[PDB]
Structure 1
Amino acid sequence: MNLYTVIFINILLSLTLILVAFWLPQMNLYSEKANPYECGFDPTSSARLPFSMKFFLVAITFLLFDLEIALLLPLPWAIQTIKTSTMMIMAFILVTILSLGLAYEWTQKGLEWTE
């Protein structure tokens, strides 16, 4: 409950701070100040439109590498086992497999962006 308490304290700090920021100052609202910036001129279209991402393959392989992290992360407990050879070989195999996949992607120009 100590940790819950610390987090609630930080939460309430942030919310009290926002309450102050909103209800302490003065307001003069009108449509010409509440509309999006776009550098002095007006936008030509909405921002809720497609933004083509040109690193999507990199995103997906980041997901798979995240899973590889999740598999590598038990090693500090895997080392206090009696075998210490099966874990060695298996971790070697996992890392080498990941490196092989990275190399295939690299050579096939997956780390390059879709111009």
Structure 2
Amino acid sequence: MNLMLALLTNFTLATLLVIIAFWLPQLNVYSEKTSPYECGFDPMGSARLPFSMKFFLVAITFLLFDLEIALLLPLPWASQTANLNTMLTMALFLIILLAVSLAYEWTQKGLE
């Protein structure tokens, strides 16, 4: 019954050492000038987070290449099998079905 006590040790040792660094030896009530400083090594950034198109298409493209490796995942389990002409010719289909989805998108990527 240790799997599950193989990790709750590892996380309670993890959260131990962070509160004996963030808490305990810390408490900065003295001068501790938390004024307007601490702005990540800069000043006031009156602009918000702007949209960037070339950094959105990288999210979606990965997601559609990520799905059909899970279809491709039980290939070693598809070895010790029955009829295997089917098993070979269907396994080669998905990879080409992944490969064409490159070549259409490959004619327009952009500065990724």
Q: Same fold (TM over 0.5)?
A: yes
Moved more, 75-84 or 53-62: 53-62
Shift of 1:33: 7.2
In the other structure, the counterpart of 2:105 is 105
Unaligned ranges ≥5, structure 2:
none
Q: What amino acid is the match of 1:24?
A: L
SS of the residue 1:16 aligns to = helix
TM-score by length of 1: 0.79
Instruction: Name which of structure 1's ranges 28-37 and 54-63 shifts more when overlaid on structure 2.
Output: 28-37
Partner of 1:84: 84
Residue deviations 1:27-83, cap 9 Å, x none? 33432376321x3x412226x633425132232121111101110001111111111
Residue 35 of structure 2 is matched in structure 1 by 32
TM-score by length of 2: 0.81
Between structures 1 and 2, the one with greater helix share: 1
Unaligned runs of 5+ in 1: none
2:39 corresponds to which letter in structure 1? P
CA RMSD of aligned residues (A): 2.2
Aligned residues: 109
Moved over 6 A (4+): none
Q: 1:43 maps to what in 2? A: 44
Whether the aligned pair in 2 keeps the contact of 1:36 and 1:43 (CA below 8 Å) is: yes
Q: Partner residue of 2:18?
A: 18
The AA in structure 2 aligned to 1:43 is M
> What CA distance in whole angstroms lies between the structure 1 residues aligned with 2:15 and 2:90?
49
